Design a protein around this ligand. Structure first.
Ligand SMILES: C[C@H]1O[C@@H](n2cnc3c(N)ncnc32)[C@H](O)[C@@H]1O
Ligand SMILES: C[C@H]1O[C@@H](n2cnc3c(N)ncnc32)[C@H](O)[C@@H]1O
Ligand code: MET
Ligand code: MET
Ligand code: SF4
Ligand code: SF4
Ligand SMILES: [Cl-]
Ligand SMILES: [Cl-]
Ligand SMILES: [Cl-]
Ligand SMILES: [Cl-]
Ligand SMILES: [Cl-]
Ligand SMILES: [Cl-]
Ligand SMILES: [Cl-]
Ligand SMILES: [Cl-]
Ligand SMILES: [Cl-]
Ligand SMILES: [Cl-]
Ligand SMILES: [Cl-]
Lengths: 380, 379
């Protein structure tokens, strides 16, 4: 009782039909009468409102937010994984990946490189998801240590993306932090459609931990139950063919989290090349901007996260829809003091579209007129 | 480079050449002319030398060692395990065990209780043994953190007993310590007889990590290769019915480790009640004292470890043969201010024979005339 329940798409569809979409666009920095999910669907589907109009409306409805942007850099602490996501190179059945694990010395060295050589004060920690309880607890212990270590080095925001979490695993991670520390739990549902989710994440009861859709989707509710605050749901764009369904589910999830008092960021990462075993689809740039626009407009206090899954030219076009910019590499311990990060196909989760160093990406954003919180350009 | 198990037929032939009477006549510093394994077998089998006489010889030959005794208290940090040892309640297939795992808070709390309420400055960290590489590395990470945390709190000696270890696992744990830190690796072979080992630990390949006898038996060689120093081999008395074979192998293992420059303690724990899937054999007190005497005599710089698997009465009669006394409970985070430690059958590895608090066990030893290093009585 009280955890997130997936919206019924046909009911949202019926509500969406009552929405006055141009009256929605006329709203001031004001909430629509209908639910956010229904408004998001109505905007998405009303093709008499062009994407360019939606993007300008969303950039404007999110314009007064402060800070305009903050940053964090992902740090993959291992690429071992017990799960079998068919779009992901870390899937356990990819026997070609070179498996890596960072200990104390390597995590610390990487954090020091990011702080001193990239000038960032936000970091995220990633792992695979593990099957047996002891492994999940031991993983939570190590990541909790990493979070504590980053805060004590002066990082001011720490994300973690380490799989679904049960109450006892949150307890282990939580012994490393305080309920008010600036720590965000990331658990992207990938698809909120159970059939598409099964197609890529697997079936339950056969040792594949991410196959349990329900444990995954209530992880934020366990985090909030434990007293924490910051969450980051997400959809992987290119798994499910019907984006209207995913948009409804993501917005509804964000609305549920808001009702629980949470501060949420929203992620809509697009598929990148990986050692995949199932087919995915490419969502085009203008439709992807439409998705970002409708989400940012309807969820104006929930920052969209933009990453180096996108190339420089797309970042440029989309940046005013984002509240978080996250440059980095999904390779294990890939950062170097004086050159671009590694993104080796044999060890990374996927191939990035933008290999530039965070300080160069973020410095150019600042020079173009958007300050980036949690970035202190090393060039002074 | 690595340890090679001795050929028992060869040791037996050499043992037949030992002058056991002359061996007992050796002065404190003198070494026999034969290998230590053959001398130990010869003493064990020469029933014209009674056990009481061997015990006296061994207590004398170790009596000048300093410190006479040190202590450490075992702290089980989890009771999860992926292996299947049939004598042990923590085997994965024991679905009745209540599984537990200590995080940062609990490990720190337990170390504070041991330090302040028990007065100990030695601790051991224990875990199950895990199957997959990522789990084994994550375990090595957590235990390395625990070791560093104990040393920083002022523990003067740390043991760990966390399963066999490969080079990359030692690398992860070792990032937490220095080469000169007082940290002892414990890996008891349990039985050096491969048939008995298979009977209890399982067959290789079935996801049962401790079934790999050779990975286990060279763990110390990987530790020494990495530059460390302190090791603790052991045999589980009661698994193999031929104690002479186990004695030979443990002494030979200790002799190999000596030849590599290592400092070794030797453990000979006897079986205790557990939720077992296979029966063990009870070794009686005389034969067990005879085993401890022959090991302590032939390996005089290698301390035997005596634990609360033995009742108070046996500790008192055997204390002179030991160089390390290790009281505690094989339950997860079992220590508590003001009380004896928990030893619940539903969460412990086995049931101890002596539940007394370390401060009272060790205080009584000191009162009777043997100082205990790494103990500061809180009374
Ligand atoms: C950390 C996040 O990376 C995303 N993810 C997983 N596989 C891919 C891929 N091939 N390309 C882009 N992103 C991916 C998932 O959404 C996951 O949760
Ligand atoms: C930690 C050490 O405890 C021993 N061990 C395993 N099972 C039992 C038992 N039922 N009784 C006593 N000791 C046992 C093993 O020798 C192991 O390595
Ligand atoms: C590296 S993917 C993100 C974290 C975790 N493996 C998950 O899929 O939830
Ligand atoms: C708790 S038993 C000792 C540590 C490890 N489980 C092993 O058997 O080697
Ligand atoms: S998406 Fe996360 S859980 Fe799934 S295979 Fe990749 S790393 Fe493992
Ligand atoms: S002796 Fe060690 S490896 Fe074997 S079942 Fe027990 S805890 Fe696991
Ligand atoms: Cl700003
Ligand atoms: Cl797979
Ligand atoms: Cl499952
Ligand atoms: Cl993202
Ligand atoms: Cl792609
Ligand atoms: Cl397949
Ligand atoms: Cl992105
Ligand atoms: Cl990124
Ligand atoms: Cl002394
Ligand atoms: Cl022991
Ligand atoms: Cl013990």
């Amino acid at each position: 009782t009280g955890d997130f329940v997936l919206p019924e798409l046909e009911d949202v569809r019926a509500e969406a039909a009552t929405v006055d979409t141009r009256a929605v666009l006329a709203l001031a920095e004001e909430e629509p009468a209908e639910s956010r999910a229904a408004v998001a669907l109505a905007l998405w589907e009303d093709r008499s409102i062009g994407t360019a109009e939606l993007q300008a409306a969303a950039e404007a409805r999110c314009g007064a937010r402060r800070p305009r942007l903050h940053t964090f850099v992902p740090l993959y602490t291992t690429n071992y994984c017990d799960s079998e996501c068919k779009m992901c190179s870390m899937r356990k059945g990819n026997h070609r990946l070179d498996r890596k694990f960072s200990g104390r010395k390597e995590i610390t060295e990487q954090l020091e490189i990011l702080y001193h050589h990239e000038g960032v004060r936000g970091v995220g920690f990633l792992t695979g998801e593990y099957e047996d309880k002891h492994t999940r607890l031991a993983s939570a212990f190590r990541i909790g240590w990493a979070i504590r270590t980053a805060l004590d080095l002066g990082f001011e925001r720490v994300y973690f993306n380490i799989g679904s979490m049960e109450q006892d695993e949150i307890d282990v991670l939580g012994e490393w932090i305080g309920r008010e520390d600036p720590v965000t739990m990331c658990v992207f549902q990938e698809s909120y459609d159970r059939e598409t989710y099964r197609r890529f994440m697997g079936k339950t009861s056969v040792g594949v931990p991410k196959a349990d859709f329900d444990r995954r989707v209530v992880s934020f509710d366990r985090w909030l139950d434990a007293g924490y605050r910051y969450v980051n749901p997400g959809v992987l764009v290119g798994l499910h063919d019907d984006l209207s369904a995913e948009l409804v589910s993501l917005v509804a999830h964000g609305d549920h989290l808001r009702s629980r008092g949470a501060t949420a960021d929203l992620s809509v990462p697009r598929m990148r090349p990986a050692m995949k075993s199932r087919d995915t689809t490419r969502v085009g740039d203008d439709d992807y901007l439409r998705l970002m626009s409708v989400v940012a407009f309807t969820c104006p206090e929930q920052r969209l996260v933009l990453t180096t899954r996108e190339p420089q030219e797309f970042q440029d076009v989309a940046l005013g829809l984002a509240g978080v910019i996250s440059p980095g590499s999904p390779d294990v311990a890939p950062y170097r003091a004086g050159c671009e990060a590694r993104n080796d196909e044999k060890s990374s989760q996927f191939l990035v579209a933008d290999l530039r160093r965070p300080r160069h990406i973020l410095g150019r954003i600042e020079a173009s007129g958007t300050p980036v919180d949690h970035f202190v350009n090393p060039a002074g």
